[PDB]
C-alpha cells in the first residue's frame, strides 16, 4: 500500500512575468485565499491607467453634449413660447423639436461608450488579480518547483509554482491483485501498518475501488482506498504500508487444520475423522476458502467429529 | 485477451482559465449533457456586457435617424401639397425627395450594423458555453487527470480534464497470432474466462478483425472483438481474460493422441 493526502493541488498562474517575491517557505500552514507569490504587476497597472484616461476622455466628451442639449432645449422652448402666437411657421418648430431629439440621442450614444469602457475596466482589473497568486484550499505547502526571481512565461503549459496537500486525512492506495478484485465488497473493514513503527495498527472502513488499473509490467493491479485519521502529525507522504484487507467474516462454520487434510486428485480432499464408533473414517470435503493456518470447510464434515491431526488413516480405529 | 469498455471518450476544454470547481466524483453516473467542471467565466461575461453596450449604442444612433427621417418626410409632403399648385419648380421637389431617400437608406445602414452586432453577440455567448464543460455521453467517471484549482491553458494541446467510459457492455481485445489470422471467419462463436474467478464461462459471437496490427517486439498479433453483456457490475477494465475461439468439428472420425505417434519419413 502506497500512501497520500486526501486532496492535492498543483497551483499555477495564467500570466507571464518575473516573480518578484514568494512570501511563504514550505512547511507553513496556509488558510484559503491567503496571498502567496507575486508576479510583476507593472504592465496591468499601465493598461489600467490607460483605460481610466479613456473614461476621463468620454467624461469630458459627454460634458460637451450636455451643453449642446441645453442650447437645443432652450431654443425649442423659446420657439414654442412665441409659437402659441403662431411663430414663423411649424417649419422652425420641426427644425427645433428634431434637433433636440438628436442632441438627446447623442448623450445616450456617449453613455453607451462610457458603459462599454467601464465594462472594459473590469477586463483591465481582472488581469491584475491573476498576478497575485492565492491558495485554492487550506493545507501546508509541500514543494516549490519555481524558485524566486525566475522568469516565467505561460503561453503553453501552466507553470508549476508550488504544490499543496491537505494533511489531515491520509488516503491509502492499496493495490490489490486482479486475481482477487472480483471480491472486495465495499464496507468490509480493514487495517494496515507501516514498516517503520513495526507494531502500531491502524484501521478503518474500505471506501471504494478505482476503475482504472495501472500495471507494473507483469500482472495488472487495482487500487482501493481507506480514510485513516491522522493526529500527532505523523505519517509522511508516500510511506510504504503493509495492508490487511478483510476478505470476509464467515462464522458458525468449521475449518480444517492444514496438517491433517489429504488432497486426492487435485480437487478431492480426504479427511480421516474419529467416529463415535471409535473407528476412524475419511470423508471427501469441498474446500475453496483457505487461510495461512487453516482451510475453510463450509461443508464436508459433521460438527464435533474428532479429527486425526497426525498419521491420518482411513478405516483405522484409534 | 485484454478487456475494455464498449466506448471510451477523453474530454477537454477550448479555453484557458482557473478551474473553480469540478462537481463530479469518480464512479458517479452521469447522464448526457450533464454539467461537469466550470472554468472561470468572468472574461466572457465582460465581452458580453461590452457587446450589449455596443447594441445599446446603435440602439440610440438609430433613434437619431428615426427623427431625421420624420423631418425629411414631413418636409417632403409639405412641399408636394403646395406643389400641386406648382411650388417652386420641380427643383425643390428633387431637393426634397432625394433627401428622404438618403434618410431612408441611413436607417437601413444602421439596421445592418444592429444585425452584424447581434450576430456578433452569438460569437460572444458561444465562448461562455465553452467554459462550462458538459459530458458528451453517458457513463461513469473513470479518472480525473486534472484536479480542482489547477490553472489550465488551452492555447495549445487540448487538456485532458477527465475520461469517460460506457460499461453497459464489455469489448474484448483477443490478440490471435498472425499465423492463424488467415482463418477466423466472422461469426464463428467463441467464449472466454477470467483468471480471477477460475470457472465462470462467458460466451458470444465474434464481431470482426482489426485491420491494423500492433506488435510486442517479436511476432505480430491481430486483434478480435466480442460483445459480452455485463450484469451485476462485474469485470473491471483491463482485466486479463483467457480466450477460446472456435475451428471446425468434423465428426465420426478417429483422432490419434500424439503421445505415442510414430512418424517415419
Curated annotation (Swiss-Prot), chain A:
UniProt entry tagged with the keyword Acetylation: no
Effect of residue 304 to C/S: Does not affect susceptibility to macrolides
Pfam families: HlyD_D23 (PF16576)
Induction and repression of expression: Expressed at very low levels under standard laboratory conditions.
Effect noted on mutating residue 304 to A: 2-fold increase in susceptibility to macrolides. Does not stimulate MacB ATPase activity
Membrane topology field: Single-pass membrane protein
Subcellular location: Cell inner membrane
Principal localisation: membrane
Any Gene Ontology biological process: xenobiotic detoxification by transmembrane export across the plasma membrane
Keyword terms, alphabetized: Antibiotic resistance, Cell inner membrane, Cell membrane, Coiled coil, Membrane, Transmembrane, Transmembrane helix, Transport
Gene Ontology MF: a single term: efflux transmembrane transporter activity
Similarity field: Belongs to the membrane fusion protein (MFP) (TC 8.A.1) family.
Function field: Part of the tripartite efflux system MacAB-TolC. MacA stimulates the ATPase activity of MacB by promoting the closed ATP-bound state of MacB, increases the capacity of MacB to bind macrolides such as erythromycin, and provides a physical link between MacB and TolC. When overexpressed, the system confers resistance against macrolides composed of 14- and 15-membered lactones but no or weak resistance against 16-membered ones. In addition, MacA binds tightly rough-core lipopolysaccharide (R-LPS), suggesting that the system could also transport R-LPS or a similar glycolipid.
Oligomeric and partner information: Homohexamer. Part of the tripartite efflux system MacAB-TolC, which is composed of an inner membrane transporter, MacB, a periplasmic membrane fusion protein, MacA, and an outer membrane component, TolC. The complex forms a large protein conduit and can translocate molecules across both the inner and outer membranes. MacA interacts with MacB and TolC, and this interaction changes its conformation.
Name the record gives this protein: Macrolide export protein MacA
Species this chain originates from: Escherichia coli (strain K12)
Amino acid at each position: 500500500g502506497k500512501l497520500d493526502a486526501l486532496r492535492k493541488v498543483d497551483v499555477g498562474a495564467q500570466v507571464s512575468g518575473q516573480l518578484k517575491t514568494l512570501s511563504v517557505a514550505i512547511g507553513d500552514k496556509v488558510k484559503k485565499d491567503q496571498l502567496l507569490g507575486v508576479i510583476d504587476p507593472e504592465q496591468a497597472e499601465n493598461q489600467i491607467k490607460e483605460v481610466e484616461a479613456t473614461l476621463m476622455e468620454l467624461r469630458a466628451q459627454r460634458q460637451q453634449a450636455e451643453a449642446e442639449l441645453k442650447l437645443a432645449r432652450v431654443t425649442y422652448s423659446r420657439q414654442q413660447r412665441l409659437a402659441q402666437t403662431q411663430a414663423v411657421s411649424q417649419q422652425d418648430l420641426d427644425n427645433a423639436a428634431t434637433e433636440m431629439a438628436v442632441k438627446q440621442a447623442q448623450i445616450g450614444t456617449i453613455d453607451a461608450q462610457i458603459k462599454r469602457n467601464q465594462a472594459s475596466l473590469d477586463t483591465a482589473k481582472t488581469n491584475l488579480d491573476y498576478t497575485r497568486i492565492v491558495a485554492p484550499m487550506a493545507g501546508e505547502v509541500t514543494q516549490i518547483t519555481t524558485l524566486q526571481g525566475q522568469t516565467v512565461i505561460a503561453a503553453q503549459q501552466a507553470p508549476n509554482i508550488l504544490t499543496l496537500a491537505d494533511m489531515s486525512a491520509m488516503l491509502v492506495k492499496a493495490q490489490v491483485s486482479e486475481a482477487d478484485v472480483i471480491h472486495l465488497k465495499p464496507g468490509q473493514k480493514a487495517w494496515f501498518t507501516v514498516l517503520g513503527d513495526q507494531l502500531t495498527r491502524y484501521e478503518g472502513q474500505i471506501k471504494d475501488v478505482l476503475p482504472t488499473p495501472e500495471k507494473v509490467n507483469d500482472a495488472i493491479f487495482y487500487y482501493a482506498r481507506f480514510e485513516v485519521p491522522n493526529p500527532n502529525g505523523l505519517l509522511r507522504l508516500d510511506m510504504t504500508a503493509q495492508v490487511h484487507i478483510q476478505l470476509t467474516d464467515v462464522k458458525n462454520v468449521l475449518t480444517i487444520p492444514l496438517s491433517a487434510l489429504g488432497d486426492p486428485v487435485g480437487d478431492n480432499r480426504y479427511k480421516v475423522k474419529l467416529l463415535r464408533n471409535g473407528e476412524t473414517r475419511e470423508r471427501e470435503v469441498t474446500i475453496g476458502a483457505r487461510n495461512d493456518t487453516d482451510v475453510e470447510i463450509v461443508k464436508g464434515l459433521e460438527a464435533g467429529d474428532e479429527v486425526v491431526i497426525g498419521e491420518a488413516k482411513p478405516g483405522a480405529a484409534q
